Amino acid sequence: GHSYEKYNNWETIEAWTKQVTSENPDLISRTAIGTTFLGNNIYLLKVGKPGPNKPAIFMDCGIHAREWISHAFCQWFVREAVLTYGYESHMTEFLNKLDFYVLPVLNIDGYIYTWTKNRMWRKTRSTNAGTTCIGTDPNRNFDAGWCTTGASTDPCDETYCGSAAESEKETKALADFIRNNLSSIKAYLSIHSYSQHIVYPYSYDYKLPENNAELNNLAKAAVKELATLYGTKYTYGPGATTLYLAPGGGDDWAYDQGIKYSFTFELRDKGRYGFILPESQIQATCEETMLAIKYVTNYVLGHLY
Ligand SMILES: CC(C)CCNC(=O)[C@@H](CC1CCCCC1)NC(=O)N[C@@H](CCCCN)C(=O)O
Ligand SMILES: [Zn+2]
């Protein structure tokens, strides 16, 4: 009983990844990039019409377990791509020229835990030495100025860096895929919630990126496109300046690998509902974010490297 306008559990999402690929074989192809701590398969969807020497964009959802709207957006991106292809001028051009590597749920173990035991869970579900405290923050487990100021050495903390960089199977499976497809990946997008922010490097240290002027102007125009629908106000700028010091992030790591277009999207809202955003707000949040994602996609095509 799947629905794009409702929050679906992992059993429903897994059944959807198989069915959406079978219903649309010419547009979507499904593969398993790895396994989680509990043993669940990390599924990845390649969206677009196949072809040779195609550039790609990587998009992940659900790094943090409680951010339910992030998981819901990845499903809506696939929904639009199969319904508007051949009917919408821009989406048709995007899928024909580019490939979309969509990872619907990264932290699967944590997401099952939010449906069964604790709704407010953030980290993974891995064991730690010398304590009964469980979990490691995946957005603090990447090899980009790992476990410095902003990340915690305490396993009982929500911002736990881990025993080592890429100590989690979920963090390694994501990083290995990017390394194996570095020459093709031109953009990295990380869907999260909440605050209504568009974050670009750097977060591990107080420093501006090489193409800071370009990333500032691109985020500015992407903010405007989202606002045209429901008037949703979004803020932008680099991580350490706008937010806080968050070392060992997926967006910061991707940038240091060569992906000059790296972004972190924080969805609805500002604090009224927070992580527990209602089902009645899914279609509104997904449609506005689509306009911002489509604008970033359009820019990347015109500035291929
Ligand atoms: C309580 C305290 C420990 C903060 C925990 N943070 C979060 O739960 C979320 C959402 C939000 C919670 C309320 C304050 C504003 C942020 N924020 C979030 O996940 N932020 C990203 C920032 C991404 C920066 C790009 N790498 C992260 O810390 O991974
Ligand atoms: Zn997050």
Ligand SMILES: [Zn+2]
């Ligand atoms: Zn639509």
Ligand SMILES: [Zn+2]
């Ligand atoms: Zn230009």
